[PDB]
Amino acid sequence: TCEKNSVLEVIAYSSSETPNRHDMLLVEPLNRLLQDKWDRFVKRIFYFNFFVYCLYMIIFTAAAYYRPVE
Amino acid sequence: YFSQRKEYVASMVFSLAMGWTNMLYYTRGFQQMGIYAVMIEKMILRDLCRFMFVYLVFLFGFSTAVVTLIEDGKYNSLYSTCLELFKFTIGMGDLEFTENYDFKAVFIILLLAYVILTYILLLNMLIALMGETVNKIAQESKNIWKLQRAITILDTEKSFLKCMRKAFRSGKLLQVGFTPDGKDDYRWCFRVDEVNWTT
Amino acid sequence: SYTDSYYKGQTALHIAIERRNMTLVTLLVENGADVQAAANGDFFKKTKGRPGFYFGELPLSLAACTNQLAIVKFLLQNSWQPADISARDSVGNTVLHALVEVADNTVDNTKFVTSMYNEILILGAKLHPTLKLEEITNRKGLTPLALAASSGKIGVLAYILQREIHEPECRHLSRKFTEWAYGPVHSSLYDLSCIDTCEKNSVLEVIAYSSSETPNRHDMLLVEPLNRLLQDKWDRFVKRIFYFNFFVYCLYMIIFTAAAYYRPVEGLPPYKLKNTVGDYFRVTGEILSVSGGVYFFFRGIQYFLQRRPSLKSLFVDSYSEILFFVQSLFMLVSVVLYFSQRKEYVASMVFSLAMGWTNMLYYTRGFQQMGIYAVMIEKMILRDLCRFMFVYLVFLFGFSTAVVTLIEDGKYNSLYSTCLELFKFTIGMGDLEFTENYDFKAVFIILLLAYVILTYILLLNMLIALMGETVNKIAQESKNIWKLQRAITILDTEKSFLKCMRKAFRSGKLLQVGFTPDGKDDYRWCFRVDEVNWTT
Ligand SMILES: C=C(C)[C@]12C[C@@H](C)[C@@]34O[C@](Cc5ccccc5)(O[C@@H]1[C@@H]3C=C(COC(=O)Cc1ccc(O)c(OC)c1)C[C@]1(O)C(=O)C(C)=C[C@@H]41)O2
Ligand code: NA
């Protein structure tokens, strides 16, 4: 919580030119923060979104397959 | 679809293919399975993108040579000729030399030169480079995976689509409580336990 | 003390020992502190999903884990309140089990853990000559040697199996005993107790039947007594039995093959026997084939009941047993359909026959040269194809449904032929005959060429590079893998043996010391080993 620009946003949304983009997340407070957030609520939401996307694709597939030929 | 054109089918079909292929986005963030997604991304963005120009140079040069040589046969059109030569590159040719046109030997020399140049030399060069890319990051998954996970977390926090912002980790705890003035600090401190077996 | 869920049982004595304050320990013990109290908080217990300091919950083990020899000497030897050197925690671990537990196979760890272990043993023998701490088993039924073998504590095994004490009145604790030495060569006797004949849980059982997560599972068989013991066991009797079993299996497969080939072509089984030689030999082959299937079936059930493997390691270990069991299942299903008046038994029989030959590769395990290929195929099937299946199926299903959406009444317009045809395109055995009359031809060509490029060029070579990485990653590991397979084969041959005899002792019932603390003399089934070292 920064209200202007937090550390995690800066690391994550970096431009991929930063030399140590991967190692910055190994610093212990950040690693524990990400693990806690993952286990706490994010993991379930991610799985839920994956499931919903799968249902969306199944419906799209079934709808397209039975298109009319007139 | 609403413009009264059959061609909507074509657009729909392409979307459907992407609709399944983009499912691989959800393999990102698994320690085992995100490696395939990132390998595909790196390979498509670097290696095929660069190699496209070399292969297109060879394809166009030999294609225009062949179209110039042949006078009214099956090859004498750039579309079919380019298709056939592309099939030759991936090892899907015929090489049936039982035709009745003049300059047969020149056609054979050109086509065999193309086959050796594309099927044996260039494609294997490409495959060696792609294998180098694949093995370069096979060990890097432990580094890569966390980063992917990190991005997801911020997005799931960023939108969150319920108006709640319970993004804090622990209580509004007091660290010191004695600033240089008479006030006291509470800083949302987060507790961490760590282990080190040294000495 | 602390009465919470986390620090439960911690008292001032634990704190003083943890702080390395000998004075506070001495004063607290002098003041009537309990030196045998159990610290059983969640912080102080063995656990996976929380940090902690497991040490065995006792002050004596706390000093022992922390490398404070003076404190353990005081706690055992003080008259104010002596400690019980054989005290057991809630897990049943003693000080020795705690010492083994806190090892991690590093140099300084190995040094001080080995030293403290030795000192505890010497103090126990001198103070309590009738007490044998190493015979004490924890709640899992493990002695400290069994615990060390289970956890992969290579350094602790290297110490224990080759332990020699050059001090009188405690030589009976030694396991290695040196008989003679020449310039480069010397011969010693090794105790060998509870290496192979234990009746509860031997070292070789624990090494062989470990769950493959133990980091040093391969190196533990290189510790010298085990290496020579297994080599002699191989050369003595196991080698001939293994070759005999391989030969018998070959005969079984030949008979099954011949019987399957000459099946009758009439409908509606079962088929009646005619008074002719062909029918007699055919039904003989059928009976032997079904007999072998039943044999493998019951062996598989016995294996699963004896091991009780978990799901997550069900295929990582027990691969060959699973495949033999699946073969036997196909044989039984073939029998059931045969007597159910169905032709479809042929189909089941065919699958079993194919597996029947392929599982022959199990017998290449245990050769230095040919064993490498079976394990390479095992790793490549379990690791690489299983993961890559989902990616390839995503591509296959996406493009297949795209194509079947596009085509109106052609050869393509059905997912079965389209999936087959696109699979042929994946392995580079398509046709690409674009001389048809369907509309949207250009869109179709774009889609199919995109699929062909994506699968045949990009994905398949990614798979092949990863498989090559797997292949070379274990090409140099052939020695270790061969050793482990050899050990498993030896133990399996010793277990069953089909004659009720177990004359698998390595050497005679020899005497090592013969001078116990009491007036008895000990014989311990010692094992003579001669070794050569050109150092200096
Ligand atoms: C139950 C499993 C795991 C399994 C059973 C069958 C279907 C199997 O395909 C797999 C999946 C498969 C199918 C096709 C191509 C690749 C993988 O792998 C084995 C299984 C795998 C094989 C390949 O054989 C090997 O790995 C050789 C081998 C390696 C190590 C061993 O210890 C061993 O001794 C038993 C044999 C043989 C088959 O059983 C067979 O003969 C047929 C027709 C298919 C193979 O499914
Ligand atoms: Na080919």
mmCIF file with all atom_site columns, N, CA and C in Angstrom, chain C residues 201-235:
data_model
loop_
_atom_site.group_PDB
_atom_site.id
_atom_site.type_symbol
_atom_site.label_atom_id
_atom_site.label_alt_id
_atom_site.label_comp_id
_atom_site.label_asym_id
_atom_site.label_entity_id
_atom_site.label_seq_id
_atom_site.pdbx_PDB_ins_code
_atom_site.Cartn_x
_atom_site.Cartn_y
_atom_site.Cartn_z
_atom_site.occupancy
_atom_site.B_iso_or_equiv
_atom_site.pdbx_formal_charge
_atom_site.auth_seq_id
_atom_site.auth_comp_id
_atom_site.auth_asym_id
_atom_site.auth_atom_id
_atom_site.pdbx_PDB_model_num
ATOM 1   N N  . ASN C 1 201 ? 13.291 -54.062 10.730 1.00 0.00 ? 201 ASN C N  1
ATOM 2   C CA . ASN C 1 201 ? 13.498 -53.116 9.635  1.00 0.00 ? 201 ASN C CA 1
ATOM 3   C C  . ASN C 1 201 ? 15.009 -52.973 9.443  1.00 0.00 ? 201 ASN C C  1
ATOM 4   N N  . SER C 1 202 ? 15.542 -53.620 8.411  1.00 0.00 ? 202 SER C N  1
ATOM 5   C CA . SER C 1 202 ? 16.979 -53.653 8.192  1.00 0.00 ? 202 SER C CA 1
ATOM 6   C C  . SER C 1 202 ? 17.426 -52.419 7.421  1.00 0.00 ? 202 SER C C  1
ATOM 7   N N  . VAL C 1 203 ? 18.742 -52.223 7.360  1.00 0.00 ? 203 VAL C N  1
ATOM 8   C CA . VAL C 1 203 ? 19.278 -51.076 6.634  1.00 0.00 ? 203 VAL C CA 1
ATOM 9   C C  . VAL C 1 203 ? 18.997 -51.210 5.147  1.00 0.00 ? 203 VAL C C  1
ATOM 10  N N  . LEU C 1 204 ? 19.219 -52.400 4.594  1.00 0.00 ? 204 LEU C N  1
ATOM 11  C CA . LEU C 1 204 ? 19.051 -52.584 3.159  1.00 0.00 ? 204 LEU C CA 1
ATOM 12  C C  . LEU C 1 204 ? 17.595 -52.443 2.748  1.00 0.00 ? 204 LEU C C  1
ATOM 13  N N  . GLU C 1 205 ? 16.669 -52.908 3.589  1.00 0.00 ? 205 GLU C N  1
ATOM 14  C CA . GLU C 1 205 ? 15.254 -52.687 3.318  1.00 0.00 ? 205 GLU C CA 1
ATOM 15  C C  . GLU C 1 205 ? 14.938 -51.204 3.263  1.00 0.00 ? 205 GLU C C  1
ATOM 16  N N  . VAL C 1 206 ? 15.482 -50.439 4.202  1.00 0.00 ? 206 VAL C N  1
ATOM 17  C CA . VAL C 1 206 ? 15.157 -49.025 4.280  1.00 0.00 ? 206 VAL C CA 1
ATOM 18  C C  . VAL C 1 206 ? 15.754 -48.276 3.100  1.00 0.00 ? 206 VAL C C  1
ATOM 19  N N  . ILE C 1 207 ? 16.978 -48.621 2.705  1.00 0.00 ? 207 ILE C N  1
ATOM 20  C CA . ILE C 1 207 ? 17.586 -47.952 1.558  1.00 0.00 ? 207 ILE C CA 1
ATOM 21  C C  . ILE C 1 207 ? 16.834 -48.308 0.287  1.00 0.00 ? 207 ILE C C  1
ATOM 22  N N  . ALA C 1 208 ? 16.544 -49.594 0.094  1.00 0.00 ? 208 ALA C N  1
ATOM 23  C CA . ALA C 1 208 ? 15.958 -50.030 -1.164 1.00 0.00 ? 208 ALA C CA 1
ATOM 24  C C  . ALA C 1 208 ? 14.527 -49.543 -1.314 1.00 0.00 ? 208 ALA C C  1
ATOM 25  N N  . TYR C 1 209 ? 13.708 -49.712 -0.281 1.00 0.00 ? 209 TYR C N  1
ATOM 26  C CA . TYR C 1 209 ? 12.293 -49.393 -0.358 1.00 0.00 ? 209 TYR C CA 1
ATOM 27  C C  . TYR C 1 209 ? 11.998 -47.968 0.084  1.00 0.00 ? 209 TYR C C  1
ATOM 28  N N  . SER C 1 210 ? 12.978 -47.073 0.015  1.00 0.00 ? 210 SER C N  1
ATOM 29  C CA . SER C 1 210 ? 12.701 -45.679 0.297  1.00 0.00 ? 210 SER C CA 1
ATOM 30  C C  . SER C 1 210 ? 11.859 -45.088 -0.826 1.00 0.00 ? 210 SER C C  1
ATOM 31  N N  . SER C 1 211 ? 11.274 -43.928 -0.555 1.00 0.00 ? 211 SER C N  1
ATOM 32  C CA . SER C 1 211 ? 10.275 -43.337 -1.433 1.00 0.00 ? 211 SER C CA 1
ATOM 33  C C  . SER C 1 211 ? 10.870 -42.491 -2.552 1.00 0.00 ? 211 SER C C  1
ATOM 34  N N  . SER C 1 212 ? 12.168 -42.609 -2.830 1.00 0.00 ? 212 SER C N  1
ATOM 35  C CA . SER C 1 212 ? 12.869 -41.916 -3.907 1.00 0.00 ? 212 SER C CA 1
ATOM 36  C C  . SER C 1 212 ? 13.077 -40.430 -3.647 1.00 0.00 ? 212 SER C C  1
ATOM 37  N N  . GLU C 1 213 ? 12.590 -39.891 -2.536 1.00 0.00 ? 213 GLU C N  1
ATOM 38  C CA . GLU C 1 213 ? 12.817 -38.506 -2.161 1.00 0.00 ? 213 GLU C CA 1
ATOM 39  C C  . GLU C 1 213 ? 14.105 -38.314 -1.373 1.00 0.00 ? 213 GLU C C  1
ATOM 40  N N  . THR C 1 214 ? 14.677 -39.388 -0.839 1.00 0.00 ? 214 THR C N  1
ATOM 41  C CA . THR C 1 214 ? 15.887 -39.303 -0.048 1.00 0.00 ? 214 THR C CA 1
ATOM 42  C C  . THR C 1 214 ? 17.030 -38.797 -0.926 1.00 0.00 ? 214 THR C C  1
ATOM 43  N N  . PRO C 1 215 ? 17.702 -37.684 -0.585 1.00 0.00 ? 215 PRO C N  1
ATOM 44  C CA . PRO C 1 215 ? 18.690 -37.126 -1.530 1.00 0.00 ? 215 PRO C CA 1
ATOM 45  C C  . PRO C 1 215 ? 19.863 -38.037 -1.839 1.00 0.00 ? 215 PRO C C  1
ATOM 46  N N  . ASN C 1 216 ? 20.319 -38.831 -0.871 1.00 0.00 ? 216 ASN C N  1
ATOM 47  C CA . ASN C 1 216 ? 21.529 -39.633 -1.001 1.00 0.00 ? 216 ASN C CA 1
ATOM 48  C C  . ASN C 1 216 ? 21.219 -41.118 -1.137 1.00 0.00 ? 216 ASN C C  1
ATOM 49  N N  . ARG C 1 217 ? 20.053 -41.442 -1.702 1.00 0.00 ? 217 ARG C N  1
ATOM 50  C CA . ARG C 1 217 ? 19.621 -42.830 -1.842 1.00 0.00 ? 217 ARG C CA 1
ATOM 51  C C  . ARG C 1 217 ? 20.618 -43.654 -2.638 1.00 0.00 ? 217 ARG C C  1
ATOM 52  N N  . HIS C 1 218 ? 21.255 -43.039 -3.624 1.00 0.00 ? 218 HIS C N  1
ATOM 53  C CA . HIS C 1 218 ? 22.232 -43.748 -4.429 1.00 0.00 ? 218 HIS C CA 1
ATOM 54  C C  . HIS C 1 218 ? 23.562 -43.917 -3.720 1.00 0.00 ? 218 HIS C C  1
ATOM 55  N N  . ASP C 1 219 ? 24.000 -42.907 -2.976 1.00 0.00 ? 219 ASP C N  1
ATOM 56  C CA . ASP C 1 219 ? 25.330 -42.952 -2.387 1.00 0.00 ? 219 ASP C CA 1
ATOM 57  C C  . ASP C 1 219 ? 25.390 -43.848 -1.164 1.00 0.00 ? 219 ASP C C  1
ATOM 58  N N  . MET C 1 220 ? 24.255 -44.075 -0.499 1.00 0.00 ? 220 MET C N  1
ATOM 59  C CA . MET C 1 220 ? 24.259 -44.905 0.698  1.00 0.00 ? 220 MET C CA 1
ATOM 60  C C  . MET C 1 220 ? 24.695 -46.333 0.399  1.00 0.00 ? 220 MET C C  1
ATOM 61  N N  . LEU C 1 221 ? 24.435 -46.829 -0.808 1.00 0.00 ? 221 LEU C N  1
ATOM 62  C CA . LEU C 1 221 ? 24.899 -48.161 -1.167 1.00 0.00 ? 221 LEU C CA 1
ATOM 63  C C  . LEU C 1 221 ? 26.393 -48.218 -1.438 1.00 0.00 ? 221 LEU C C  1
ATOM 64  N N  . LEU C 1 222 ? 27.067 -47.078 -1.559 1.00 0.00 ? 222 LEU C N  1
ATOM 65  C CA . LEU C 1 222 ? 28.509 -47.060 -1.748 1.00 0.00 ? 222 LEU C CA 1
ATOM 66  C C  . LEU C 1 222 ? 29.285 -47.173 -0.447 1.00 0.00 ? 222 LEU C C  1
ATOM 67  N N  . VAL C 1 223 ? 28.627 -47.069 0.706  1.00 0.00 ? 223 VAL C N  1
ATOM 68  C CA . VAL C 1 223 ? 29.322 -47.262 1.970  1.00 0.00 ? 223 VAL C CA 1
ATOM 69  C C  . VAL C 1 223 ? 29.758 -48.718 2.052  1.00 0.00 ? 223 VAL C C  1
ATOM 70  N N  . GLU C 1 224 ? 31.028 -48.924 2.366  1.00 0.00 ? 224 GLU C N  1
ATOM 71  C CA . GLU C 1 224 ? 31.818 -50.099 2.000  1.00 0.00 ? 224 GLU C CA 1
ATOM 72  C C  . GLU C 1 224 ? 31.227 -51.445 2.416  1.00 0.00 ? 224 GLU C C  1
ATOM 73  N N  . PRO C 1 225 ? 30.791 -51.625 3.677  1.00 0.00 ? 225 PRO C N  1
ATOM 74  C CA . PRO C 1 225 ? 30.167 -52.906 4.049  1.00 0.00 ? 225 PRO C CA 1
ATOM 75  C C  . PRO C 1 225 ? 28.975 -53.274 3.197  1.00 0.00 ? 225 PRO C C  1
ATOM 76  N N  . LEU C 1 226 ? 28.119 -52.308 2.875  1.00 0.00 ? 226 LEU C N  1
ATOM 77  C CA . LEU C 1 226 ? 26.966 -52.621 2.049  1.00 0.00 ? 226 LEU C CA 1
ATOM 78  C C  . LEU C 1 226 ? 27.395 -52.982 0.637  1.00 0.00 ? 226 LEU C C  1
ATOM 79  N N  . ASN C 1 227 ? 28.374 -52.261 0.093  1.00 0.00 ? 227 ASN C N  1
ATOM 80  C CA . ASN C 1 227 ? 28.829 -52.519 -1.266 1.00 0.00 ? 227 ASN C CA 1
ATOM 81  C C  . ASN C 1 227 ? 29.388 -53.930 -1.402 1.00 0.00 ? 227 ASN C C  1
ATOM 82  N N  . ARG C 1 228 ? 30.283 -54.316 -0.492 1.00 0.00 ? 228 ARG C N  1
ATOM 83  C CA . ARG C 1 228 ? 30.853 -55.658 -0.561 1.00 0.00 ? 228 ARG C CA 1
ATOM 84  C C  . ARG C 1 228 ? 29.817 -56.721 -0.233 1.00 0.00 ? 228 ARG C C  1
ATOM 85  N N  . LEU C 1 229 ? 28.916 -56.436 0.708  1.00 0.00 ? 229 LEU C N  1
ATOM 86  C CA . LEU C 1 229 ? 27.890 -57.401 1.069  1.00 0.00 ? 229 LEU C CA 1
ATOM 87  C C  . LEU C 1 229 ? 26.992 -57.704 -0.116 1.00 0.00 ? 229 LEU C C  1
ATOM 88  N N  . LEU C 1 230 ? 26.542 -56.664 -0.812 1.00 0.00 ? 230 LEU C N  1
ATOM 89  C CA . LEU C 1 230 ? 25.676 -56.881 -1.961 1.00 0.00 ? 230 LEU C CA 1
ATOM 90  C C  . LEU C 1 230 ? 26.424 -57.562 -3.088 1.00 0.00 ? 230 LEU C C  1
ATOM 91  N N  . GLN C 1 231 ? 27.700 -57.219 -3.283 1.00 0.00 ? 231 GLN C N  1
ATOM 92  C CA . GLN C 1 231 ? 28.463 -57.872 -4.339 1.00 0.00 ? 231 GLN C CA 1
ATOM 93  C C  . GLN C 1 231 ? 28.613 -59.363 -4.068 1.00 0.00 ? 231 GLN C C  1
ATOM 94  N N  . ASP C 1 232 ? 28.891 -59.737 -2.822 1.00 0.00 ? 232 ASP C N  1
ATOM 95  C CA . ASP C 1 232 ? 28.993 -61.155 -2.516 1.00 0.00 ? 232 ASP C CA 1
ATOM 96  C C  . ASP C 1 232 ? 27.640 -61.838 -2.604 1.00 0.00 ? 232 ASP C C  1
ATOM 97  N N  . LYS C 1 233 ? 26.573 -61.164 -2.178 1.00 0.00 ? 233 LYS C N  1
ATOM 98  C CA . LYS C 1 233 ? 25.244 -61.755 -2.289 1.00 0.00 ? 233 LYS C CA 1
ATOM 99  C C  . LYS C 1 233 ? 24.894 -62.013 -3.742 1.00 0.00 ? 233 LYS C C  1
ATOM 100 N N  . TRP C 1 234 ? 25.254 -61.080 -4.616 1.00 0.00 ? 234 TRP C N  1
ATOM 101 C CA . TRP C 1 234 ? 25.044 -61.263 -6.043 1.00 0.00 ? 234 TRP C CA 1
ATOM 102 C C  . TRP C 1 234 ? 25.827 -62.455 -6.562 1.00 0.00 ? 234 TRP C C  1
ATOM 103 N N  . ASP C 1 235 ? 27.127 -62.494 -6.279 1.00 0.00 ? 235 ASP C N  1
ATOM 104 C CA . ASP C 1 235 ? 27.954 -63.569 -6.813 1.00 0.00 ? 235 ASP C CA 1
ATOM 105 C C  . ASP C 1 235 ? 27.625 -64.923 -6.209 1.00 0.00 ? 235 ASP C C  1
#
